[PDB]
Short mmCIF file of C-alpha atoms in Angstrom, two decimals:
data_model
loop_
_atom_site.label_atom_id
_atom_site.label_comp_id
_atom_site.label_asym_id
_atom_site.label_seq_id
_atom_site.Cartn_x
_atom_site.Cartn_y
_atom_site.Cartn_z
CA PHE A 7 164.46 103.46 73.91
CA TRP A 8 166.89 104.55 71.91
CA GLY A 9 170.65 103.59 71.80
CA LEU A 10 173.83 103.95 68.80
CA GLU A 11 177.23 102.72 70.05
CA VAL A 12 179.63 104.89 68.47
CA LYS A 13 183.36 103.47 67.69
CA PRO A 14 186.79 105.05 67.55
CA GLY A 15 188.59 103.84 64.47
CA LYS A 16 185.90 105.89 61.87
CA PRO A 17 183.96 108.58 61.71
CA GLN A 18 180.49 107.36 61.85
CA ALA A 19 177.40 108.91 59.91
CA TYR A 20 173.74 108.69 61.72
CA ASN A 21 170.32 108.96 59.75
CA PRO A 22 168.13 110.70 62.32
CA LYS A 23 165.28 110.32 59.30
CA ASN A 24 165.20 106.94 60.27
CA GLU A 25 163.65 107.01 64.08
CA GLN A 26 159.86 107.24 63.93
CA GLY A 27 160.72 110.36 66.19
CA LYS A 28 162.68 113.36 67.77
CA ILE A 29 165.80 111.37 69.56
CA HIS A 30 166.60 112.44 73.09
CA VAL A 31 170.32 111.74 73.65
CA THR A 32 170.23 111.74 77.67
CA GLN A 33 174.21 109.83 78.03
CA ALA A 34 176.98 108.79 76.98
CA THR A 35 178.35 106.01 78.75
CA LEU A 36 182.53 104.47 77.93
CA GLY A 37 182.64 101.09 76.25
CA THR A 38 184.34 98.37 77.29
CA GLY A 39 188.38 98.58 77.45
CA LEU A 40 191.72 98.70 79.06
CA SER A 41 192.71 101.83 77.44
CA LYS A 42 193.00 104.70 80.04
CA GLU A 43 193.31 107.98 77.45
CA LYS A 44 190.15 110.30 77.80
CA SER A 45 186.78 109.54 75.19
CA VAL A 46 185.49 112.61 73.43
CA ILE A 47 182.73 112.50 71.18
CA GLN A 48 182.41 115.14 68.52
CA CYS A 49 179.60 116.51 66.42
CA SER A 50 179.34 117.79 62.85
CA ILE A 51 176.10 118.73 61.55
CA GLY A 52 176.41 118.15 57.55
CA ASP A 53 180.16 120.07 56.75
CA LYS A 54 180.24 122.11 59.93
CA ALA A 55 183.09 122.33 61.98
CA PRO A 56 182.21 119.47 64.82
CA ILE A 57 181.30 120.86 69.26
CA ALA A 58 182.72 118.54 71.13
CA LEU A 59 179.63 116.71 73.37
CA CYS A 60 181.44 115.09 76.29
CA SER A 61 184.71 114.12 77.56
CA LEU A 62 184.89 110.87 79.69
CA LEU A 63 187.87 109.61 81.33
CA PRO A 64 188.34 106.14 82.45
CA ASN A 65 188.35 105.41 86.12
CA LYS A 66 186.80 108.76 87.41
CA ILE A 67 184.00 109.82 85.19
CA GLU A 68 182.63 106.97 82.96
CA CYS A 69 179.36 107.73 82.09
CA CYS A 70 177.57 111.61 82.14
CA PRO A 71 174.36 112.56 81.47
CA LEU A 72 173.52 114.57 77.79
CA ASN A 73 170.33 116.64 76.59
CA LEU A 74 170.75 116.48 72.97
CA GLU A 75 167.82 116.82 70.64
CA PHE A 76 168.53 115.33 66.68
CA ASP A 77 165.81 116.06 64.11
CA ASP A 78 164.98 115.16 60.30
CA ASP A 79 166.03 118.61 60.09
CA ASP A 80 169.85 117.34 61.42
CA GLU A 81 170.33 116.65 57.26
CA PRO A 82 173.88 114.04 57.92
CA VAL A 83 175.16 114.00 61.69
CA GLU A 84 178.75 112.66 61.85
CA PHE A 85 180.01 111.18 64.92
CA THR A 86 183.94 110.95 65.91
CA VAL A 87 185.37 109.36 68.97
CA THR A 88 188.89 110.07 70.35
CA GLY A 89 190.44 107.64 71.83
CA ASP A 90 190.89 103.55 72.05
CA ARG A 91 187.14 102.86 73.27
CA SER A 92 183.71 103.41 71.97
CA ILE A 93 180.59 105.64 73.43
CA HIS A 94 177.64 104.01 73.80
CA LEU A 95 174.62 107.06 73.42
CA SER A 96 171.80 106.23 74.97
CA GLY A 97 167.98 108.35 75.00
CA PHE A 98 164.47 107.81 74.23
CA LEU A 99 161.84 108.73 70.95
CA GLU A 100 159.48 111.47 71.09
CA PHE B 4 157.52 107.37 92.82
CA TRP B 5 159.00 103.84 90.25
CA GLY B 6 161.74 101.49 91.37
CA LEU B 7 163.92 98.34 90.63
CA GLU B 8 166.59 96.42 91.78
CA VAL B 9 168.73 95.05 89.08
CA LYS B 10 170.66 92.25 90.04
CA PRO B 11 174.13 90.50 88.76
CA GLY B 12 175.02 88.19 86.70
CA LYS B 13 171.75 86.37 85.06
CA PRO B 14 169.99 88.86 82.51
CA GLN B 15 167.06 90.45 83.94
CA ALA B 16 163.67 91.01 81.86
CA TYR B 17 161.43 94.07 82.54
CA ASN B 18 158.65 95.76 79.84
CA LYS B 19 155.61 105.79 80.91
CA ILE B 20 158.56 104.64 83.11
CA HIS B 21 160.72 107.73 83.11
CA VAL B 22 163.98 106.29 84.71
CA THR B 23 165.83 109.26 86.35
CA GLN B 24 168.31 107.73 88.83
CA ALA B 25 171.25 104.30 88.52
CA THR B 26 172.79 103.93 92.29
CA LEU B 27 175.01 101.45 92.95
CA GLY B 28 173.51 98.34 95.65
CA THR B 29 175.48 97.02 98.77
CA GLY B 30 178.70 95.05 98.68
CA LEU B 31 181.99 95.60 99.08
CA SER B 32 183.42 94.89 95.47
CA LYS B 33 185.19 98.23 93.84
CA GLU B 34 184.74 96.40 90.38
CA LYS B 35 182.75 99.05 88.40
CA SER B 36 179.34 98.08 88.10
CA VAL B 37 177.65 98.62 83.92
CA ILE B 38 174.20 98.36 83.25
CA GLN B 39 173.48 97.56 79.62
CA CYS B 40 170.02 97.56 78.30
CA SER B 41 168.71 95.03 74.76
CA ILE B 42 165.74 95.66 73.00
CA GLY B 43 164.35 92.53 71.65
CA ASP B 44 166.74 90.77 69.83
CA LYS B 45 169.00 94.20 69.19
CA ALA B 46 172.99 94.10 70.57
CA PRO B 47 172.99 95.53 74.20
CA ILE B 48 173.46 99.90 75.06
CA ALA B 49 175.34 100.69 77.98
CA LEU B 50 173.46 102.95 79.81
CA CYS B 51 176.12 104.22 82.61
CA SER B 52 179.25 102.63 84.70
CA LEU B 53 179.11 103.33 88.43
CA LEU B 54 182.86 103.15 90.04
CA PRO B 55 182.87 101.96 93.73
CA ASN B 56 184.30 105.00 96.12
CA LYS B 57 183.97 107.30 93.35
CA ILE B 58 180.59 107.32 90.76
CA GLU B 59 177.98 105.34 93.03
CA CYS B 60 174.65 107.14 91.49
CA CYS B 61 174.01 108.13 88.10
CA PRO B 62 171.29 111.23 86.70
CA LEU B 63 169.73 109.25 83.75
CA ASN B 64 166.99 110.04 81.36
CA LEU B 65 165.55 107.33 79.68
CA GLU B 66 161.76 106.67 78.65
CA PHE B 67 160.21 103.48 79.06
CA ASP B 68 156.84 103.34 76.92
CA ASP B 69 152.95 101.80 77.63
CA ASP B 70 153.10 99.58 75.01
CA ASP B 71 155.75 97.42 76.98
CA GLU B 72 157.98 95.70 74.92
CA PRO B 73 160.80 93.09 75.20
CA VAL B 74 163.69 94.82 77.29
CA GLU B 75 166.97 93.26 79.16
CA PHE B 76 168.76 95.00 81.64
CA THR B 77 172.13 93.28 82.10
CA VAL B 78 174.62 94.23 85.62
CA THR B 79 178.40 93.67 84.97
CA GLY B 80 180.07 93.57 88.10
CA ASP B 81 179.33 91.60 91.91
CA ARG B 82 176.53 94.44 93.19
CA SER B 83 173.45 95.36 92.29
CA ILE B 84 172.09 98.82 90.83
CA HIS B 85 169.02 100.59 92.03
CA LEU B 86 166.97 102.14 89.05
CA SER B 87 164.66 104.81 90.18
CA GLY B 88 162.22 107.47 88.36
CA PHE B 89 158.57 108.27 88.04
CA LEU B 90 155.79 107.38 85.91
CA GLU B 91 153.71 109.81 84.27
CA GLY C 9 157.67 127.12 95.11
CA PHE C 10 160.80 125.71 96.88
CA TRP C 11 160.96 122.77 98.80
CA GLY C 12 163.55 121.17 101.26
CA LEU C 13 163.59 118.06 103.42
CA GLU C 14 166.51 117.33 105.99
CA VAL C 15 166.55 113.92 106.38
CA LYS C 16 168.08 113.08 109.85
CA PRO C 17 170.33 109.16 110.36
CA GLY C 18 168.98 107.03 112.23
CA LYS C 19 165.02 106.11 112.49
CA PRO C 20 162.99 107.48 109.02
CA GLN C 21 160.57 110.04 108.39
CA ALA C 22 156.59 110.88 106.85
CA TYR C 23 155.75 113.05 104.39
CA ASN C 24 152.46 115.70 103.71
CA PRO C 25 149.47 115.53 102.23
CA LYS C 26 150.07 118.21 98.96
CA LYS C 27 153.04 117.56 93.53
CA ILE C 28 156.89 117.86 95.10
CA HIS C 29 159.63 117.54 92.28
CA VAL C 30 162.81 116.39 94.66
CA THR C 31 165.56 117.29 92.26
CA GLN C 32 168.78 117.28 94.57
CA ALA C 33 170.48 115.43 97.63
CA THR C 34 173.13 117.41 99.73
CA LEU C 35 175.33 116.16 102.42
CA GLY C 36 174.73 116.68 105.83
CA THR C 37 177.00 118.40 108.13
CA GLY C 38 179.57 116.22 109.83
CA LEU C 39 183.29 114.89 110.28
CA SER C 40 182.14 111.13 108.60
CA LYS C 41 184.55 110.03 105.33
CA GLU C 42 181.52 107.33 105.24
CA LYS C 43 179.48 106.97 102.70
CA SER C 44 175.42 108.35 102.81
CA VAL C 45 173.03 106.30 101.01
CA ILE C 46 169.16 107.72 101.04
CA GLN C 47 166.55 105.24 100.47
CA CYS C 48 162.31 105.64 99.27
CA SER C 49 160.04 102.84 99.76
CA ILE C 50 155.84 102.55 98.75
CA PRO C 51 163.20 100.23 100.09
CA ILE C 52 164.68 101.96 97.07
CA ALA C 53 168.21 103.60 96.71
CA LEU C 54 168.22 107.10 95.30
CA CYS C 55 171.41 108.00 95.81
CA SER C 56 175.32 107.78 97.15
CA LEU C 57 177.02 110.42 97.83
CA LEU C 58 180.58 110.18 99.43
CA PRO C 59 182.13 112.69 101.87
CA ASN C 60 185.36 114.48 100.57
CA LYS C 61 184.17 113.24 96.82
CA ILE C 62 180.82 113.63 95.73
CA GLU C 63 178.42 115.50 98.53
CA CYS C 64 174.93 116.53 96.43
CA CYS C 65 173.70 115.04 92.92
CA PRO C 66 171.13 115.94 91.18
CA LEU C 67 167.35 114.09 91.35
CA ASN C 68 164.60 114.12 89.04
CA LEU C 69 161.70 112.11 91.44
CA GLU C 70 157.98 112.86 91.30
CA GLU C 71 150.42 107.03 100.00
CA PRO C 72 153.67 105.99 102.67
CA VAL C 73 156.63 107.49 101.85
CA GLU C 74 159.78 106.85 105.20
CA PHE C 75 162.96 108.35 103.79
CA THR C 76 165.66 106.15 105.70
CA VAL C 77 169.90 107.24 105.10
CA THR C 78 172.62 105.16 105.86
CA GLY C 79 175.62 106.91 107.04
CA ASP C 80 176.54 109.25 110.09
CA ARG C 81 175.27 112.56 107.87
CA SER C 82 171.86 113.83 107.01
CA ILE C 83 170.91 114.44 103.29
CA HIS C 84 169.38 117.35 102.43
CA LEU C 85 166.47 116.58 100.25
CA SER C 86 165.68 120.12 97.84
CA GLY C 87 163.45 121.22 94.99
CA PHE C 88 159.64 122.73 94.23
CA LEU C 89 156.21 121.99 93.86
CA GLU C 90 153.78 122.15 90.86
CA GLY D 2 165.87 135.21 79.64
CA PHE D 3 169.09 134.43 81.24
CA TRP D 4 169.32 134.50 84.91
CA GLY D 5 172.13 134.61 87.35
CA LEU D 6 173.35 135.86 90.91
CA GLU D 7 176.82 136.04 92.41
CA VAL D 8 175.83 134.76 96.24
CA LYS D 9 179.40 135.87 98.67
CA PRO D 10 180.56 133.81 101.48
CA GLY D 11 180.05 135.26 105.17
CA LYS D 12 176.68 137.59 105.92
CA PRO D 13 173.68 135.91 104.27
CA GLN D 14 172.17 137.74 101.51
CA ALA D 15 168.85 138.37 100.58
CA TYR D 16 167.03 137.60 97.42
CA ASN D 17 163.68 138.87 96.60
CA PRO D 18 161.97 137.11 93.94
CA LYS D 19 159.49 139.91 93.03
CA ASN D 20 161.96 141.97 91.69
CA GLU D 21 162.28 139.38 88.38
CA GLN D 22 159.24 139.34 85.83
CA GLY D 23 159.14 136.07 85.98
CA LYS D 24 159.35 132.61 87.74
CA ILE D 25 163.37 131.76 88.48
CA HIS D 26 164.71 128.20 87.39
CA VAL D 27 167.99 127.85 89.47
CA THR D 28 170.11 124.97 87.48
CA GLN D 29 173.98 125.36 88.24
CA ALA D 30 175.83 126.47 91.14
CA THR D 31 179.72 127.30 90.22
CA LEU D 32 182.50 128.08 92.31
CA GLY D 33 184.25 131.61 91.75
CA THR D 34 187.54 132.29 92.00
CA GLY D 35 189.72 132.23 95.19
CA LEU D 36 192.86 129.65 96.52
CA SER D 37 190.58 128.41 99.33
CA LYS D 38 190.57 124.40 99.24
CA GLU D 39 187.73 124.10 101.87
CA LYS D 40 184.28 122.76 100.72
CA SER D 41 181.54 125.59 99.67
CA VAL D 42 177.85 125.14 100.44
CA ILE D 43 174.88 127.48 99.53
CA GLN D 44 172.17 127.15 101.54
CA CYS D 45 168.71 128.69 101.57
CA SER D 46 166.04 129.58 103.99
CA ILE D 47 162.50 130.83 103.06
CA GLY D 48 160.36 132.06 105.46
CA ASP D 49 161.94 132.14 108.67
CA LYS D 50 162.44 128.38 108.67
CA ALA D 51 165.43 126.27 109.27
CA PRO D 52 168.25 126.70 105.94
CA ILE D 53 168.36 123.53 103.18
CA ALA D 54 171.51 123.28 101.74
CA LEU D 55 171.08 123.04 97.87
CA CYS D 56 175.10 122.02 96.99
CA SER D 57 178.44 120.95 98.13
CA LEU D 58 181.18 122.42 95.97
CA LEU D 59 184.92 120.66 96.17
CA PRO D 60 188.49 122.77 95.04
CA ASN D 61 189.77 121.14 92.44
CA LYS D 62 186.92 118.03 92.70
CA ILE D 63 183.98 119.33 91.75
CA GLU D 64 183.18 123.26 90.75
CA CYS D 65 180.23 123.41 89.81
CA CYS D 66 176.64 121.16 89.82
CA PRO D 67 173.53 120.94 87.85
CA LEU D 68 170.19 122.52 89.72
CA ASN D 69 166.37 122.19 89.09
CA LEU D 70 164.88 124.58 91.91
CA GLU D 71 162.14 127.58 91.39
CA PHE D 72 161.62 130.46 93.06
CA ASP D 73 158.40 132.30 92.30
CA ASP D 74 156.71 135.42 94.62
CA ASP D 75 155.48 133.35 97.50
CA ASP D 76 159.35 132.50 98.53
CA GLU D 77 158.95 135.51 100.50
CA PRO D 78 162.42 136.60 102.00
CA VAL D 79 164.83 134.34 100.05
CA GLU D 80 168.11 134.12 102.54
CA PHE D 81 171.40 132.49 100.55
CA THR D 82 174.45 131.47 102.69
CA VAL D 83 177.46 130.28 101.64
CA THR D 84 180.24 128.68 104.10
CA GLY D 85 183.59 128.70 102.50
CA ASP D 86 185.80 131.84 101.30
CA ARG D 87 184.64 131.83 97.63
CA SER D 88 181.54 133.31 95.85
CA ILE D 89 178.75 130.63 94.04
CA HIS D 90 177.58 131.80 91.17
CA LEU D 91 174.21 130.64 90.77
CA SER D 92 172.88 131.01 86.87
CA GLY D 93 169.45 129.93 84.96
CA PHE D 94 166.33 131.41 82.76
CA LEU D 95 163.09 133.33 83.47
CA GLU D 96 159.87 131.38 82.82
CA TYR D 97 157.34 133.82 81.37
CA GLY E 8 167.83 121.09 65.99
CA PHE E 9 170.97 120.25 67.27
CA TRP E 10 172.86 123.44 68.21
CA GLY E 11 177.04 124.08 69.11
CA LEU E 12 179.20 127.24 69.77
CA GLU E 13 183.04 126.59 70.78
CA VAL E 14 184.04 129.43 72.75
CA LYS E 15 187.71 130.74 72.29
CA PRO E 16 189.80 131.58 75.36
CA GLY E 17 191.07 134.91 76.00
CA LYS E 18 189.54 137.85 73.92
CA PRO E 19 185.32 137.55 75.33
CA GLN E 20 183.43 136.11 72.38
CA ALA E 21 180.06 138.06 71.07
CA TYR E 22 177.25 135.73 70.63
CA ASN E 23 173.62 136.63 68.93
CA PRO E 24 170.86 134.47 69.61
CA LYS E 25 168.68 136.91 67.18
CA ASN E 26 170.31 134.73 64.39
CA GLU E 27 168.86 131.51 65.12
CA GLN E 28 165.39 130.38 64.16
CA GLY E 29 163.86 129.38 67.71
CA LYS E 30 164.84 129.68 71.32
CA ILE E 31 169.02 128.47 71.96
CA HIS E 32 168.86 125.24 74.90
CA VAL E 33 172.49 125.22 76.41
CA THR E 34 172.89 121.79 78.00
CA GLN E 35 176.71 120.67 78.16
CA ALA E 36 179.63 122.43 78.09
CA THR E 37 183.09 120.31 77.13
CA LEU E 38 186.68 120.90 77.47
CA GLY E 39 188.68 121.65 73.83
CA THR E 40 191.81 119.93 72.87
CA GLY E 41 195.17 121.51 74.59
CA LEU E 42 197.68 120.01 77.41
CA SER E 43 197.00 122.49 79.92
CA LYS E 44 196.05 121.06 83.81
CA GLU E 45 194.24 125.02 84.55
CA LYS E 46 190.47 125.18 85.48
CA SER E 47 188.35 126.21 82.32
CA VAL E 48 185.54 128.51 84.08
CA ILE E 49 183.01 129.94 81.05
CA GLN E 50 180.99 132.81 81.65
CA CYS E 51 177.89 135.05 80.36
CA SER E 52 177.14 138.58 80.68
CA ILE E 53 173.92 139.82 79.04
CA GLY E 54 174.47 143.75 77.75
CA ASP E 55 175.84 146.10 80.44
CA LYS E 56 175.75 143.41 83.27
CA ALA E 57 178.58 141.80 85.61
CA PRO E 58 179.72 138.76 83.89
CA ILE E 59 178.19 135.14 85.68
CA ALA E 60 180.49 131.94 85.75
CA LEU E 61 178.61 128.72 84.50
CA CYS E 62 180.62 126.00 85.08
CA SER E 63 184.05 125.09 85.84
CA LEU E 64 185.87 122.12 83.77
CA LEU E 65 189.26 120.80 85.55
CA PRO E 66 191.36 118.99 83.08
CA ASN E 67 191.64 115.41 83.97
CA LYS E 68 188.95 115.49 86.38
CA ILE E 69 185.92 117.01 85.28
CA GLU E 70 186.13 117.88 81.40
CA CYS E 71 182.35 117.88 81.02
CA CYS E 72 179.36 118.65 82.86
CA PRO E 73 175.40 119.32 82.49
CA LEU E 74 173.90 122.61 81.74
CA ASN E 75 170.15 123.66 81.71
CA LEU E 76 170.33 127.49 79.93
CA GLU E 77 167.85 128.97 77.29
CA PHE E 78 168.90 132.48 75.19
CA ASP E 79 165.79 134.18 74.01
CA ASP E 80 166.15 137.10 71.26
CA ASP E 81 166.99 139.02 74.69
CA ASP E 82 169.93 139.43 76.18
CA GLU E 83 170.82 140.69 72.89
CA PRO E 84 174.30 139.88 72.56
CA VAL E 85 175.23 137.27 75.40
CA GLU E 86 178.95 137.67 75.91
CA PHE E 87 181.10 134.53 76.54
CA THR E 88 184.61 134.77 78.73
CA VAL E 89 186.38 131.74 79.06
CA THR E 90 189.23 131.55 81.44
CA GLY E 91 192.47 129.13 80.68
CA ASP E 92 194.71 127.98 77.44
CA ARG E 93 191.36 125.76 76.11
CA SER E 94 188.08 126.41 74.48
CA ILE E 95 184.54 125.25 75.53
CA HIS E 96 182.38 123.86 73.63
CA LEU E 97 178.82 124.70 74.47
CA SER E 98 175.81 122.14 72.93
CA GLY E 99 172.12 121.97 73.03
CA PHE E 100 168.97 122.03 70.82
CA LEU E 101 166.93 124.67 69.20
CA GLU E 102 163.25 125.35 70.88
CA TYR E 103 161.01 126.35 67.41
#
């Protein structure tokens, strides 16, 4: 089992080399709070333009299935969350 | 086939298992039901969030291993969450 | 290798000796605005469909079955075999 | 190996998997253009058998849904039937 | 092996899978920034073939959706076309 809480108020580096296998990210879940603003999580692989991975809507869509693979070769990964609420990534190691 | 009803309130201990769905249990509560997972001593991670009368099930893709470690499922709200999937 | 199974509401339903991948529940025909839940046993909930909101959902599922559906509408299971 | 098929509403539409060079993985249904707010259901009947609903799309609520279906040679004639006034775009890939 | 592509609206956008070191698994579409409430549809054409809708995102209702598509050296120029005023972010992974 694998999980990471990405906080909103600062872009967050993640290093897949710290995991003993390939990371399967299979879900994003909205963290606690009262904010009704959309929460978007973006991903940049070293210094490339960020790509939006999903978009959660408080009281409508508070989780969504993903199917992403991060390995050693994804040098530094940078996760950025828009909005006032954390996004919980979950999945498993291969 | 594999399935587990996680009851709300008191954290539920568990321990290859493919978890592929969460479904909202019976009850009248309109409050969100969130299921979290905490490994051993680690901070719990939210696995999904179900909304009565809007989203009452969601697809998952989780793997828990043969070794069987210390996993704790915690459900927020007044309603059980039915995990389903299979074993290979 | 298509596969389909309309579970009607009311009394449950058996299964065929020979592997089945169920990958979708779809809400059957009807006017009922009631929640339709489908369940399995070996009695666990597989999914929950809401008329005029969520009328299908993706599944990933693989000795006695018995399917039972809650609600006024049937649920169409679909997928394939391996 | 991208694969896609637009199923038009009304008259049932026959599909022959023998025309594809591999097994067909259908993974998405997407609602076609149109102003109709009526639900769009796509059904599948293989042999002469009874049709099975594959999904149900709701204009301005749920206009696509993930699928995981496999069609091969053995699915003799497949008949797709769409309810409503809007086409359904099936997409996926071929397995060689 | 993370993979991502922002498809901009309006002018169709050519994509070449031969430029990637393995097979492309597209597994999500996410709605780009913007204030437009209009539907965003992404379509795909492989060479000369009529475009097929891959999904349909609804601002403030459905702003991402799971996909399961495979692009290989084939298709050559998979032309992606986005309806609406907002980019669509495709994400997924490479299979080596």
